[PDB]
DNA sequence: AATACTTTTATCAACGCAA
RNA sequence: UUGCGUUGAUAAAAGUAUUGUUUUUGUACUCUAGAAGCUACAAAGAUAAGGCUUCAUGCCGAAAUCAACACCGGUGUU
């Protein structure tokens, strides 16, 4: 086990920034609500065919209230679930023709397709049109890179994440680039402080090191992105032998060990941390840098 | 004194370097990369085209308020009311009076949609059961009247009549809307006199108005490169012209046609090889005279000679019979046509006239390239048409392909094939980075993507593991391009090099000891 | 802008330029310390980002003239994005190489419109400096009532013992001859 | 973001005639 | 290894059509001319975030290329 391994790195920059899929949000009080919050809604496209049925007893059985005809045409939905009490809405069809609305007489529209609450609001677009009501976003947003910063007045580390939709055509001459300021906006988020020392970027399959301070121990990952955006610094990693991490194995004496899953999840915005890159030949010579440069590469 | 040895995956190669007079490992590695997926590209190139084509639905609409804002019918598009229906001002407009805001409503609408061209199987019988209805009303008609008797209008959607089930589609071709288009205007122009004929004229461009697919997308000063305009101050005629391929041995010749007199007379010569006066006999047999074929050619080969045909050892066989033999097809085929014939011409002419028809498909490509390549060929226009009726006659012939030679290397040959029963391979052979390894031989020989892929990154692996150490002798492959592309480089610098063809570090350690 | 320590450099050092004793400065109106709590401010004790927001802004609003306040977050905007600058030089003095190189372009670009005229900064009891510093600006840009858009402030180091001319040639060429000596 | 059409150029295989 | 005649698989590039998702508006359906914005139908706008000049049969944006740094296709080191 004196093998060494190559990599290859991924660092181009204009990829799929998102889903092209524009979906609608709404505003409501669903399951353990004590406040208004905003919900991706879903759509079942159609019921008579054996899948919207499957998908709407689904809905049904997790719970009722997530239908938006639940809430507002509850009289037609009692008129919906009278069928589903004696047979489903195939059997309806190919009798007594499509399931109209509640009305007086016989001359409501007819009834194909349900919308519902689906999820809450996770990583997005904000693309709201002018004259709108609710926001319409864009999901599936990738992360691109790291950079890796460190002030000396706490003595541990701060990580930023870039996605591909941080990046920009720009104004005046149509470079692909971001602003400072922006970047200034993402450092602040991120809680990185102002005065700290830029280190290094990180790509995917790009050779990280980690060594401890109190106890001289070396481990060595491949970095793969910026996981869970809601509390900082966390970067999953992947193994440098293998492909996966699956166990509770343990990696070294601060980290700790491996979820059930087999992802890699951890926390280097801690103390008693010390990180380097690994920068190899194709041949595996494994060169060690500390500084990269002066500052991020932000032009293209 | 080393041995080299690599073991070549879809993803990954492993390498190894070894001594084998004691038998110690120098090197060993194992070099991982992604896989070649042919499934990006897919969706890159879809998404350019669907781009593409939403781009030029947007600049027929900003084209139509151009012309309508130029001619001067409407100033401001801000108070243009779009709660008005557009099917009923498109079917009243041709008996009535248009107020000059619900015509460009009808103009709009109608530019939105306009139909399919390739017409001039379900599907196909849909919208030929639609063209059936519609060759007495205009599709205007239809839509307004799918609407006020159905509801629904759009889409592909199914109705119950009282006796029968169909399924209705929006799908009629070009010529109805345009004629519908026509009908319009001719009434509002007897109507409102601002809209001259060249308005006519105009709409009718933003109309029916598509590209030719040789064309491909730009303009002349906008310099695409995947358009006839090219970015480097030029313009093609076609853009498949530059995709024609090269000659066997000449590697920057372009190819000739297949259906002109250089190349059948070449394959009627090397069937006929495998002497002199009879060769050009049946040579001017069969150009001159007609009603010609394989079993006419073997009853010839039996008239002049006197003899029953026997002692056939060069004849080529079909699955179905036999007596495969090439003849002048093309030749007698174009013979036929009221202008002047082709026997008494050039050489040059007729290459570049088979050129010319064998690459364009249509009128337009065919015409152009004979007015535009022919320098100062001054032909008429009736030739062009009856070439352009003749093209559209044989087009499982004509369109045959392009043949694998060049004109450089068979005006090199032409004559010399006749004086001796000679063949192809026999007479070429009696006619016979300054230290790394290039990337021509493993960018041009393309297999797979993946094969592509994991040979050029084996190379780089190569190269640096021979600028690191030094010289070698042996080196080992986990086929026979790369073989003879090292072999040839080896003895050009000179040096004998015998090239022959963690899991995967050890096994091309294995191999390296093997 | 962001208000941090080297916010409160600044201050102390552009304090210590324009005004020659610290009492002209720290008593007046809209800024008001007293002698114990000017001592706990300038000496290290008092942190300035809970202050409060109309005193730090009437402090900075006395010290810098308008478009200078923009030149100051747009030099921290550069500052704390390169580790030459942040490790190497304090902020007062990228600040000052930020506003030279604004000047430069000004007599680059357009230099027959550049006029300039001597400043004049009031104490805490109404009297005023005369000669406080050198005002720089453009004509072009000239709101009305002698209100200027673009306009800068320095301060003259020379050694000898001759003014500043008056008149708009003799001036811009003291300015284009003592491009060292202002700051 | 998927389903219908039209066209061009090129390369591998394998089935034969020859070398 | 090379040429010709058949038919399978693939790759690259081009031209079109009809929906799908989503926003406003109108009409129907519902509750008392107002309200709710569910459920249908029809217009108009958008369709990876964006950007360019030549003013138009306008154009580009989801692939591959890859260890960095210094000195004359080569040359030195962590």
Redesign the interface.
């Known amino acids: 086990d004196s093998i060494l391994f190559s990599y290859q790195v991924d660092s181009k920059f204009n990829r799929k920034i998102s889903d092209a899929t524009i979906y609608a949000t709404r505003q409501a009080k669903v399951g353990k609500d004590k406040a208004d919050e905003t919900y991706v809604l879903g759509k079942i496209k159609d019921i008579y065919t054996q899948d919207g049925y499957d998908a709407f007893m689904k809905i049904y059985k997790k719970d009722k209230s997530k239908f938006l005809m639940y809430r507002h045409d509850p009289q037609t939905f009692e008129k919906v679930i009278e069928p589903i009490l004696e047979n489903p809405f195939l059997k309806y069809k190919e009798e007594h023709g499509y399931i109209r609305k509640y009305s007086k007489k016989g001359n409501g529209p007819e009834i194909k397709s349900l919308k519902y609450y689906d999820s809450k609001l996770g990583n997005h677009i904000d693309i709201t049109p002018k004259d709108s009501n609710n926001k319409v976003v864009l999901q599936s947003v990738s992360p691109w890179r790291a950079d890796v910063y460190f002030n000396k007045t706490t003595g541990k580390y701060e990580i930023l994440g870039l996605k591909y939709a941080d990046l920009q055509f720009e104004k005046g001459t149509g470079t692909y680039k971001i602003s400072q300021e922006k970047y200034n906006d993402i450092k602040k988020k991120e809680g990185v402080d102002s005065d700290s020392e830029f280190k290094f970027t990180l790509y995917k399959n790009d050779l990280l090191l980690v060594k401890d301070t109190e106890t001289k121990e070396q481990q060595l990952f491949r970095f793969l992105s910026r996981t869970m955006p809601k509390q900082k610094h966390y970067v999953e990693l992947k193994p440098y032998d293998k492909q996966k991490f699956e166990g509770g194995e343990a990696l070294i004496k601060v980290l700790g060990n491996v979820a059930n899953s087999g992802q890699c999840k951890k926390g280097l915005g801690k103390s008693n941390i010390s990180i380097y890159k690994v920068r190899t030949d194709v041949l595996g010579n494994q060169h060690i840098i500390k500084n990269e440069g002066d500052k991020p590469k932000l032009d293209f | 004194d080393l041995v080299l040895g690599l073991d070549i995956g879809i993803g990954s190669v492993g ?1 190894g370097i070894l001594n084998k007079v004691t038998g110690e490992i120098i ?8 896989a070649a997926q042919a499934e990006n590209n897919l969706v890159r190139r879809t998404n350019r085209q669907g781009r593409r084509l939403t781009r030029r639905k947007k600049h027929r609409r900003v084209r139509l308020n151009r012309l309508f804002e130029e001619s001067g019918l409407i100033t401001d598009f801000t108070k243009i009311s779009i709660n008005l229906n557009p099917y009923q001002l498109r079917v009243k407009g041709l008996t009535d009076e248009l107020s000059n805001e619900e015509l460009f409503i009808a103009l709009k609408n109608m530019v939105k949609h306009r139909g399919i061209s390739y017409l001039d199987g379900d599907y196909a019988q849909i919208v030929k059961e639609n063209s059936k209805q519609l060759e007495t009303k205009t599709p205007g008609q239809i839509q307004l009247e799918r609407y006020q008797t159905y509801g629904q209008l759009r889409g592909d959607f199914t109705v119950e009549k009282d006796g029968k089930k169909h399924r209705l589609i929006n799908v009629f071709p070009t010529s109805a809307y345009r004629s519908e288009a026509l009908r319009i205007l001719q009434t509002q122009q007897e109507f409102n006199p601002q809209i001259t004929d060249e308005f006519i004229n105009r709409y009718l461009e933003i109309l029916t108005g598509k590209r030719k697919y040789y064309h491909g997308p730009g303009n002349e000063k906008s310099r695409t490169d995947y358009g006839r305009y090219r970015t480097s101050g030029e313009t093609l005629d076609n853009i498949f012209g530059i995709l024609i391929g090269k000659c066997t041995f000449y590697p920057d010749e372009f190819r000739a046609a297949k259906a002109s007199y250089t190349a059948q007379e070449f394959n009627l010569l090397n069937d006929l090889n495998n002497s002199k006066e009879q060769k050009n006999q049946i040579i001017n047999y069969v150009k001159n005279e007609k009603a010609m074929g394989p079993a006419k050619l073997f009853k010839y080969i039996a008239k002049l000679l006197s003899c029953d045909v026997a002692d056939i050892k060069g004849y080529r066989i079909d699955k179905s019979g036999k007596a495969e033999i090439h003849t002048f097809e093309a030749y007698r085929k174009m013979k036929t046509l009221e202008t002047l014939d082709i026997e008494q011409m050039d050489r040059e002419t007729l290459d570049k006239l088979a050129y010319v028809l064998t690459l364009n498909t249509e009128r337009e490509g065919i015409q152009e390239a004979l007015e535009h390549e022919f320098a100062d060929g001054s032909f008429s226009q009736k030739q062009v048409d009856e070439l352009v009726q003749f093209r559209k006659a044989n087009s499982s012939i004509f369109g045959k392909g392009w043949h694998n030679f060049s004109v450089k290397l068979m005006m090199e040959l032409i004559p010399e094939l006749y004086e001796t029963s000679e063949e192809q391979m026999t007479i070429l052979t009696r006619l016979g980075k300054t230290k790394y390894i290039d990337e021509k031989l493993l960018t041009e020989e393309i297999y797979n993507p993946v094969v592509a892929k994991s040979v050029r990154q084996a190379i ?2 190569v190269n ?2 021979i600028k ?1 150490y030094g010289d070698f002798d042996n080196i080992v492959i986990e086929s026979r391009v790369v073989l003879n592309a090292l072999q040839e480089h080896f003895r050009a610098h000179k040096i004998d090099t015998k090239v022959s063809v ?1 899991h995967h ?1 050890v096994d091309a350690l294995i191999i390296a000891a093997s | 802008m962001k208000i941090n320590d080297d916010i409160k450099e600044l201050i102390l050092e552009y304090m210590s330029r324009y005004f020659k004793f610290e009492n002209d400065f720290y008593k007046l109106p809209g800024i008001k310390f007293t002698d114990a709590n000017w001592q706990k401010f300038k000496n290290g004790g008092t942190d300035i980002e809970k202050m409060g927001a109309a005193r730090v802004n009437a402090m900075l609003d006395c010290l810098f003239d308008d478009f200078e306040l923009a030149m100051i977050g747009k030099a921290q905007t550069n500052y704390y994005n390169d580790n030459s600058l942040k490790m190497n030089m304090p902020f007062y003095t990228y600040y000052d190489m930020f506003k030279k190189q604004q000047l430069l372009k000004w007599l680059k670009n357009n230099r027959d419109d550049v006029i300039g005229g001597t400043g004049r900064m009031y104490t805490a009891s109404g009297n005023y400096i005369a000669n406080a510093y050198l005002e720089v600006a453009l004509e072009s840009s000239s709101l009305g009532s002698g209100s200027y858009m673009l306009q800068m402030r320095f301060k003259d180091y020379s050694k000898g013992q001759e003014p500043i001319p008056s008149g708009r040639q003799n001036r811009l060429e003291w300015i284009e001859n003592n491009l060292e000596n202002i700051r």
């Not at chain 2, 090197?27 to 992604?34: D, E, L, V």
């Open positions: 390498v090197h060993k590695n194992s070099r991982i990369f992604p780089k692996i640096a593991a690191e963690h570090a």
